[PDB]
Design an enzyme around this catalytic site. Structure first.
Site, mmCIF file in Angstrom:
data_model
loop_
_atom_site.group_PDB
_atom_site.id
_atom_site.type_symbol
_atom_site.label_atom_id
_atom_site.label_comp_id
_atom_site.label_asym_id
_atom_site.label_seq_id
_atom_site.Cartn_x
_atom_site.Cartn_y
_atom_site.Cartn_z
ATOM 1 N N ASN A 140 0.824 -1.224 0.000
ATOM 2 C CA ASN A 140 0.000 0.000 0.000
ATOM 3 C C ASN A 140 0.853 1.268 0.000
ATOM 4 O OD1 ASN A 140 -2.341 -1.729 0.376
ATOM 5 N ND2 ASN A 140 -1.830 -1.800 2.560
ATOM 6 N N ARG A 145 7.722 7.128 -1.826
ATOM 7 C CA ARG A 145 7.631 6.885 -0.390
ATOM 8 C C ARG A 145 8.481 5.669 0.038
ATOM 9 N NH1 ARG A 145 1.906 6.021 2.768
ATOM 10 N NH2 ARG A 145 2.726 6.259 4.894
ATOM 11 N N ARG A 195 4.354 -1.276 8.705
ATOM 12 C CA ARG A 195 5.442 -2.002 8.047
ATOM 13 C C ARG A 195 6.624 -2.253 8.992
ATOM 14 N NH1 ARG A 195 2.540 0.924 3.497
ATOM 15 N NH2 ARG A 195 2.844 2.726 4.864
ATOM 16 N N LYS A 240 2.229 -10.925 -3.437
ATOM 17 C CA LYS A 240 2.861 -9.888 -4.244
ATOM 18 C C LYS A 240 4.311 -9.728 -3.854
ATOM 19 C CE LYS A 240 2.486 -5.437 -3.380
ATOM 20 N NZ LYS A 240 3.864 -4.951 -3.104
ATOM 21 N N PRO A 257 4.465 -10.570 -10.006
ATOM 22 C CA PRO A 257 3.763 -9.922 -8.892
ATOM 23 C C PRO A 257 2.456 -9.304 -9.336
ATOM 24 C CG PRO A 257 6.000 -8.994 -9.174
ATOM 25 C CD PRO A 257 5.810 -10.016 -10.243
ATOM 26 N N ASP A 259 -0.759 -6.887 -8.042
ATOM 27 C CA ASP A 259 -1.482 -5.990 -7.138
ATOM 28 C C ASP A 259 -2.510 -5.213 -7.961
ATOM 29 O OD1 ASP A 259 -0.264 -3.907 -8.524
ATOM 30 O OD2 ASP A 259 1.138 -3.386 -6.933
ATOM 31 N N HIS A 261 -2.497 -2.440 -9.376
ATOM 32 C CA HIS A 261 -1.950 -1.770 -10.565
ATOM 33 C C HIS A 261 -1.779 -2.737 -11.729
ATOM 34 C CE1 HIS A 261 -0.818 0.762 -7.148
ATOM 35 N NE2 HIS A 261 -0.727 1.782 -7.983
ATOM 36 N N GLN A 278 -15.205 -13.168 -7.846
ATOM 37 C CA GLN A 278 -14.648 -11.833 -7.587
ATOM 38 C C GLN A 278 -15.690 -10.842 -7.034
ATOM 39 O OE1 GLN A 278 -12.669 -7.905 -9.450
ATOM 40 N NE2 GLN A 278 -13.576 -9.395 -10.864
ATOM 41 N N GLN A 304 6.663 -8.345 -17.911
ATOM 42 C CA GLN A 304 5.874 -7.462 -17.048
ATOM 43 C C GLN A 304 6.619 -6.189 -16.660
ATOM 44 O OE1 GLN A 304 3.223 -7.895 -12.999
ATOM 45 N NE2 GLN A 304 5.332 -8.668 -12.984
#
Ligand code: NI
Length: 313
Positions: A140, A145, A195, A240, A257, A259, A261, A278, A304
């Protein structure tokens, strides 16, 4: 006050590796995303840490030019053969990207369009420890960041290597440094948030329950599906993050991976929907990862990365 080098300001300290730019674009690869530790301190010159050395790297159309800062210890000099062989391994230069691109475009019409503009995107072969804790920070989170979290983490916990201009370079910390009774509290002050707990707890777990960093090297030798499952036993490591580590540090080129995106890209650009309920989810995420391995083959993770670079620019 030691300074970052440029190819013009100190030509005598650089050594070349033959490498066409179609096989490696530094601005696409070293840009934060795979690694969070390289910075373009002057135009076209990328400086960052590998293991316990700082490097600056730059390139022409045909050559990768390299200079290494060993510290205040040694007399300043050109990179040795063995040091260059490290970079060669880091960039996985044995892998021909031209051939891979050709193969991916042959069955993927969209990749063909996209990849023209974004050649030379390959996977770094990263240290498993650095990779593990960098991607625990990625949940997230955005690249800018993550880069700050990782840098501040290295500054507080890892060894000082050298200072160049206003940049002090630190090595990535070892497991023991991240596992101590204060670590989470400290890491929260650095802004890791939730985290922080996963970083300390995963470091402890590896040390106490898996036999230290030797375990991460065993995963490098294990097959993708077993390594992936093993990593998912760590605090804060789901599919991920396990896939990131598999692809970028444990030599599993088929790891993809997934996520929100990647879900986006897939749905918008490939028309993909899950053949399941889903009402994203872990089984649907794995299905999407399977869709791309099915489409691209055993180097699906590498394909990817090309798409992720093209979308980000
Ligand atoms: Ni739709």
């Amino acid at each position: 006050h030691m300074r970052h080098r440029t190819l013009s300001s100190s030509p005598a300290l650089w050594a070349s590796i033959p490498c066409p730019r179609s096989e490696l674009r530094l601005d696409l690869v070293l840009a934060s995303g795979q690694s969070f530790r390289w910075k373009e301190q002057s135009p076209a010159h990328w400086s960052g840490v590998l293991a316990d050395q700082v490097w600056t790297l730059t390139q022409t159309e045909d050559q990768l030019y390299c200079t290494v800062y060993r510290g205040d210890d040694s007399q300043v000099s050109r990179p040795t053969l063995e040091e260059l062989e490290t970079l060669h391994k880091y960039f996985q230069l044995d892998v021909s990207l031209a051939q891979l691109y050709s193969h991916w475009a042959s069955v993927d019409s969209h990749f063909q369009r996209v990849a023209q503009k974004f050649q030379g995107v390959r996977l770094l072969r990263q240290d498993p420890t650095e990779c593990l804790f960098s991607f625990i920070c990625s949940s997230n989170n955005n690249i800018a960041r993550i880069t700050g979290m990782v840098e501040r983490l290295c500054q507080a916990f890892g060894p000082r290597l050298i200072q160049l201009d206003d940049v002090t370079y630190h090595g990535f910390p070892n497991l023991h440094a991240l596992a101590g009774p204060e670590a989470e509290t400290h890491l929260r002050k650095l802004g890791l948030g939730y985290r922080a707990r996963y970083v300390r707890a995963s470091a402890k777990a590896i040390l106490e329950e898996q036999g230290g960093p030797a375990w991460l090297q065993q995963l490098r030798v294990a097959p993708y599906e077993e390594a992936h499952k093993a990593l998912c036993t760590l605090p804060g490591v789901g599919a991920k993050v396990a896939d990131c580590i598999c692809l970028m540090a444990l030599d599993k080129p088929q790891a993809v991976p997934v996520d929100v995106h990647v879900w986006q890209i897939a749905h918008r650009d490939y028309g993909w929907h899950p053949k399941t309920s889903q009402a994203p989810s872990p089984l649907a995420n794995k299905e999407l990862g399977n869709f791309f391995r099915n489409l691209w083959g055993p180097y699906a993770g590498w394909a990817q990365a090309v798409l992720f670079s093209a979308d980000l620019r």
